[PDB]
Design an enzyme around this catalytic site. Structure first.
Site, short mmCIF file in Angstrom:
data_model
loop_
_atom_site.label_atom_id
_atom_site.label_comp_id
_atom_site.label_asym_id
_atom_site.label_seq_id
_atom_site.Cartn_x
_atom_site.Cartn_y
_atom_site.Cartn_z
N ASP A 1 0.97 -1.43 -0.07
CA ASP A 1 0.10 -0.01 -0.15
C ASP A 1 0.91 1.20 -0.04
O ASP A 1 1.60 1.56 0.86
CB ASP A 1 -1.09 -0.12 1.16
CG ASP A 1 -2.02 1.26 1.13
OD1 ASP A 1 -2.29 1.30 0.09
OD2 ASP A 1 -2.45 1.67 2.36
N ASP B 1 -1.52 5.19 -5.48
CA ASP B 1 -1.98 4.58 -4.27
C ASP B 1 -2.20 3.12 -4.61
O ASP B 1 -3.10 2.66 -5.46
CB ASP B 1 -3.15 5.21 -3.79
CG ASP B 1 -3.54 4.21 -2.45
OD1 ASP B 1 -2.95 3.22 -2.25
OD2 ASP B 1 -4.69 4.60 -1.89
C1 LIG Z 1 -7.89 9.47 1.22
O1 LIG Z 1 -7.14 9.73 0.13
C2 LIG Z 1 -6.87 8.36 -0.56
C3 LIG Z 1 -5.87 7.79 0.37
O2 LIG Z 1 -6.50 6.34 0.40
C4 LIG Z 1 -5.81 5.47 1.28
C5 LIG Z 1 -6.36 4.14 0.56
C6 LIG Z 1 -5.38 3.02 1.29
O3 LIG Z 1 -4.51 2.80 0.03
C7 LIG Z 1 -6.16 1.67 1.48
C8 LIG Z 1 -5.11 0.67 1.53
O4 LIG Z 1 -5.86 -0.83 1.56
C9 LIG Z 1 -6.76 -1.11 2.25
C10 LIG Z 1 -7.49 -2.34 1.52
C11 LIG Z 1 -8.68 -3.03 2.07
F1 LIG Z 1 -9.32 -4.05 1.46
C12 LIG Z 1 -9.32 -2.27 3.16
C13 LIG Z 1 -8.85 -1.25 3.63
F2 LIG Z 1 -9.61 -0.34 4.71
C14 LIG Z 1 -7.53 -0.68 3.27
N1 LIG Z 1 -7.18 1.24 0.32
C15 LIG Z 1 -8.44 1.69 0.46
O5 LIG Z 1 -8.89 2.20 1.19
C16 LIG Z 1 -9.09 0.96 -0.77
C17 LIG Z 1 -8.85 -0.12 -0.98
C18 LIG Z 1 -9.61 -0.72 -1.94
C19 LIG Z 1 -9.57 -2.06 -2.56
O6 LIG Z 1 -10.22 -3.00 -3.20
N2 LIG Z 1 -8.25 -2.63 -2.57
C20 LIG Z 1 -7.80 -3.81 -2.77
C21 LIG Z 1 -7.18 -4.70 -1.72
C22 LIG Z 1 -6.98 -3.96 -4.13
C23 LIG Z 1 -7.71 -4.66 -5.39
C24 LIG Z 1 -7.00 -4.45 -6.56
C25 LIG Z 1 -5.84 -3.80 -6.60
C26 LIG Z 1 -5.29 -3.03 -5.77
C27 LIG Z 1 -5.90 -3.25 -4.42
C28 LIG Z 1 -10.67 -0.03 -2.65
C29 LIG Z 1 -10.69 1.33 -2.58
N3 LIG Z 1 -11.71 2.01 -3.05
C30 LIG Z 1 -12.54 3.22 -2.40
S1 LIG Z 1 -12.14 1.94 -4.79
C31 LIG Z 1 -13.67 1.13 -4.87
O7 LIG Z 1 -11.16 1.25 -5.50
O8 LIG Z 1 -12.74 3.21 -5.11
C32 LIG Z 1 -10.10 1.81 -1.39
C33 LIG Z 1 -5.88 5.88 2.62
O9 LIG Z 1 -7.25 5.64 3.09
N4 LIG Z 1 -5.02 5.91 3.78
C34 LIG Z 1 -5.25 6.28 4.94
C35 LIG Z 1 -6.02 7.55 4.87
O10 LIG Z 1 -5.88 8.46 4.37
N5 LIG Z 1 -7.07 7.63 5.99
C36 LIG Z 1 -7.81 8.99 6.18
C37 LIG Z 1 -9.36 8.70 6.17
C38 LIG Z 1 -10.01 8.46 7.32
C39 LIG Z 1 -11.25 8.22 7.41
C40 LIG Z 1 -12.00 7.95 6.19
C41 LIG Z 1 -11.15 7.93 4.85
C42 LIG Z 1 -9.79 8.25 4.92
C43 LIG Z 1 -4.26 6.69 5.75
C44 LIG Z 1 -3.88 5.69 6.81
C45 LIG Z 1 -3.00 7.34 5.22
#
Ligand SMILES: COCCO[C@H](C[C@H](O)[C@H](COc1cc(F)cc(F)c1)NC(=O)c1cc(C(=O)N[C@H](C)c2ccccc2)cc(N(C)S(C)(=O)=O)c1)C(=O)N[C@H](C(=O)NCc1ccccc1)C(C)C
Length: 373
Positions: free
Chosen positions: A35, A220
Site C-alpha cells: 500500500d 496509491d
Molecule cells: C484519502 O485519500 C486516498 C488515500 O486512501 C488510502 C487508501 C489506502 O490505500 C487503503 C489501503 O488498503 C486497504 C485495503 C482494504 F481492503 C481495506 C482497507 F481499509 C484498506 N485502500 C483503500 O482504502 C481502498 C482499497 C480498495 C481495494 O479494494 N483494495 C484491494 C486490496 C485492491 C484490489 C486490486 C488492486 C489493488 C488493491 C478499494 C478502494 N476504493 C475506495 S475503490 C472502490 O477502489 O474506489 C479503497 C487511505 O485511506 N489512507 C489512509 C487515510 O488517508 N485515511 C484517512 C481517512 C480517514 C477516514 C476515512 C477515509 C480516509 C491513511 C492511514 C494514510
C-alpha cells in the site's frame, strides 16, 4: 540481487497485491498487501473469519510491546490494534532483517478481504501520515536507516491471478520498455503528484487543472480504482458515455454498482476511449503523459459471458491513481530524489490497435496553478 525480487508479488484479481514477509524469531510467514497510500505496517494478530493465519506475538522472542493502542482508518475500512516492534525480513526482497514497528491488528471492520490471501498491510508512504502520529517510523524508513538499501523502490503491478514485482532499493530495467518519465513528489506525505491535463480519446477535458488535483492527487497501490473528484468524474463519465453510446449501460454500471456482460470474446473494446493523464515533469514548463486503455478501467469480474465492472469512481478526497493506473506501468518511487517515475511495463495488456503509453516531452504552462492550496 534484483532478479531475486522479480515476480515477488501475487494476488487475486481485484483483491490486492501482496508480498511475502516474515515477522519475529522464529520467523512467522505472512502475506502483506503493498500500500503506497498509507504509512503503517500492520498484521492480523487475532483470529478472524477471513484470516487463515495471523501474527502470534507470544511465539516471538524478539517481540517488544510498545504499550500503545492504534487505530487506522482508510477509505474502505479500518482497524485497531496494539503497537509493538519486532524483527522483519522479506524472503524475495533484500537479504536483511530489520527491527520495525508493527501494529498487531486486534479488530477491524471491512479491512480484510475474504479469499484475498493477505493477512496484513505494508504502508509505504511517509511518516507524516502514519498513525497515531509521525514519530511512528514507517517500515521503509526503518529499512533504509538500518541497512544500506537505497531509498527507492519500484512497483510493477501485472493485472488481468495477478502478479508483479516490488523491486526494493532499485530499478530493474528488464521490467519496462522505452524511457522512464518523472513527476515531482509535491510533498512527502502521501505520494502526492500534480496532474496538469486530462484528455479522453485525444480531446482535452478542458477544466481548470486545479479541479484535477482538488484537494490532492496521489499514487496509491492499495486502491483498486482511478478515483476522481466529483466535477472531474462527471466530466469523464459524460465523455466515456458519449464514446460508447452505441451501447446500453444501466446508470448503476457507471457507479460500479452493476456489471456489463458480453458473449465471450466480443467485448467492444474499440468503443471505450483511452484516457491520458498529463503529469508535471522535471523541467520548467515540462510535462509528460501516461495513457490508459479501457482494459485497465473495465475490470473483469469472474456462464460464458465476459463481465466487467467500471473502475473509475468518485472521490471527496482528491484524485487517486490506483491499480487501474499503475497496472499499465513500471512505477519508480524515487524517495531519494523526491520523484515518481513511469515507464510502460513489460507486462502491459494487449489491445490490438491501441497501446498504453508514457510519452514526452510536452510543453505546458503554469503548472503552478494546478496545485491545490
Ligand atoms: C484519502 O485519500 C486516498 C488515500 O486512501 C488510502 C487508501 C489506502 O490505500 C487503503 C489501503 O488498503 C486497504 C485495503 C482494504 F481492503 C481495506 C482497507 F481499509 C484498506 N485502500 C483503500 O482504502 C481502498 C482499497 C480498495 C481495494 O479494494 N483494495 C484491494 C486490496 C485492491 C484490489 C486490486 C488492486 C489493488 C488493491 C478499494 C478502494 N476504493 C475506495 S475503490 C472502490 O477502489 O474506489 C479503497 C487511505 O485511506 N489512507 C489512509 C487515510 O488517508 N485515511 C484517512 C481517512 C480517514 C477516514 C476515512 C477515509 C480516509 C491513511 C492511514 C494514510
Amino acid at each position: 540481487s534484483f532478479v531475486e525480487m522479480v515476480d515477488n508479488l501475487r494476488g487475486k484479481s481485484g483483491q490486492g497485491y501482496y508480498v511475502e514477509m516474515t515477522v519475529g524469531s522464529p520467523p512467522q510467514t505472512l502475506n502483506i498487501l503493498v500500500d503506497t497510500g498509507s504509512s503503517n505496517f500492520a498484521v492480523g494478530a487475532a483470529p478472524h473469519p477471513f484470516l487463515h493465519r495471523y501474527y502470534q506475538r507470544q511465539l516471538s522472542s524478539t517481540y517488544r510491546d510498545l504499550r500503545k493502542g492504534v487505530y487506522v482508518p482508510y477509505t474502505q475500512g479500518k482497524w485497531e490494534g496494539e503497537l509493538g516492534t519486532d524483527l522483519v525480513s522479506i524472503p524475495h526482497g533484500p537479504n536483511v532483517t530489520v527491527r520495525a514497528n508493527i501494529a498487531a491488528i486486534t479488530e477491524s471492520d471491512k479491512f480484510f478481504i475474504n479469499g484475498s490471501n493477505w493477512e496484513g498491510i505494508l504502508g509505504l508512504a511517509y511518516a507524516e501520515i502514519a498513525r497515531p502520529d509521525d514519530s511512528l517510523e514507517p517500515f521503509f524508513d526503518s529499512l533504509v536507516k538500518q541497512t544500506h538499501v537505497p531509498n527507492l523502490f519500484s512497483l510493477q503491478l501485472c493485472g488481468a491471478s495477478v502478479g508483479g514485482s516490488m523491486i526494493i532499493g532499485g530499478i530493474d530495467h528488464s521490467l519496462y520498455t522505452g524511457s522512464l518519465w518523472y513527476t515531482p513528489i509535491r510533498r512527502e506525505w502521501y505520494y502526492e503528484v500534480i496532474i496538469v491535463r486530462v484528455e479522453i480519446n485525444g480531446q482535452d477535458l478542458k477544466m481548470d487543472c486545479k479541479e484535477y488535483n482538488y484537494d490532492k492527487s496521489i499514487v496509491d497501490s492499495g486502491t483498486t480504482n482511478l478515483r476522481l473528484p466529483k466535477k472531474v468524474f462527471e466530466a469523464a463519465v459524460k465523455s466515456i458515455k458519449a464514446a460508447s453510446s452505441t451501447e446500453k449501460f444501466p446508470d448503476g454500471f457507471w457507479l460500479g454498482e452493476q456489471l456489463v456482460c458480453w458473449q465471450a470474446g466480443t467485448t467492444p473494446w474499440n468503443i471505450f476511449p483511452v484516457i491520458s493523464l498529463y503529469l508535471m515533469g522535471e523541467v520548467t514548463n515540462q510535462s509528460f503523459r501516461i495513457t490508459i486503455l479501457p482494459q485497465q478501467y473495465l475490470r473483469p469480474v469472474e456462464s460464458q459471458d465476459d463481465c466487467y465492472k467500471f473502475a473509475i469512481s468518485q472521490s471527496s478526497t482528491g484524485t487517486v491513481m490506483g491499480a487501474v493506473i499503475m497496472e499499465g506501468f513500471y512505477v519508480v518511487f524515487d524517495r531519494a530524489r523526491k520523484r515518481i517515475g513511469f515507464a510502460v511495463s513489460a507486462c502491459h495488456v494487449h489491445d490490438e490497435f491501441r497501446t498504453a503509453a508514457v510519452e514526452g516531452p510536452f510543453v505546458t504552462l503554469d503548472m503552478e496553478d494546478c496545485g491545490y492550496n
